[PDB]
Amino acid sequence: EFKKVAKETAITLQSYLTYQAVRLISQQLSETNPGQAIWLGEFSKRHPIQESDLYLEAMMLENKELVLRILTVRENLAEGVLEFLPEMVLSQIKQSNGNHRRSLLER
Amino acid sequence: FKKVAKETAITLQSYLTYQAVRLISQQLSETNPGQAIWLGEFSKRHPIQESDLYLEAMMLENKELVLRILTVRENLAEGVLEFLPEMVLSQIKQSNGNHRRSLLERL
Structure with missing residues (x-):
């Protein structure tokens, strides 16, 4: 269960970082080879990232x-980004939890 | 890579929420099935x-x-975040490894 969550979250992340990489290569290509750009948006249609x-x-x-x-x-994105994820997400979840708790225990 | 980090942390925050809802949904299917059904179609109305x-x-x-x-x-975030950067970085390197090898050796 902690194991099942971790393993599923990691798969999700590996997938998401692939998606980010395609987005990034798409900006690059839209400035340099818009042929292959219109192309990639179309391949992304026939196949889910x-x-x-x-x-x-x-x-x-x-x-x-x-x-x-x-x-x-x-x-490259993985080496740049991953080690920063635990502070940021844990910290964001506290800020979010706090806002929702207040919004509920003020009404 | 900061915009990518920010967009990754938000996806991650939201994914741990989803995963929380999945566990709570499992508890409810047992103790209070009416809520479980409710939560199910709530989740089709509002994208997690x-x-x-x-x-x-x-x-x-x-x-x-x-x-x-x-x-x-x-609770989930505190439990599982520290584990993720190694798993993602290692799954990707391993996955890059198979796709590279499949492409290069096999053509």
Whole structure:
């Protein structure tokens, strides 16, 4: 149960950081190769990013450069961002909890 | 990578909320099935992805539960956050590893 939550949250995160990496490569490409940009928005239609491994495995058939870029960018975001997540989220949850508690125990 | 961190922490905050609602939903299916059904179709009306809007909407309907979610989401966060950066960083490196190897050796 703590185990099931952790394992599910990590999968979610790995998936989300893939999504962030595609968003980031999309800004880059919209400024440099808008061909391949309109393209990527369209590939994202036929395949849900939420299934990250299936999204990449499917892309591999169509556009091998762009997969490798995605794997590189997602790892960079991961190394930059992950270790900051516990303070920020734990701290945000306290601020949020506090606001909602007040809004409920003032009405 | 700060905008990515902020957007990642908010997704994470909201995901731990979801996960809190999932545990509370399991307890209710046992002790109070009427609420469990309620909570189920509440969750189809208000997307948990927007955590604060969801607790705010729920406030008009069931305030005991909102308070319960907050408590539970904080416990979960305190329990599970410290574990996440290693798991995500390690799953990604491992996953990059298989996709790279599949692409390069197999074509």
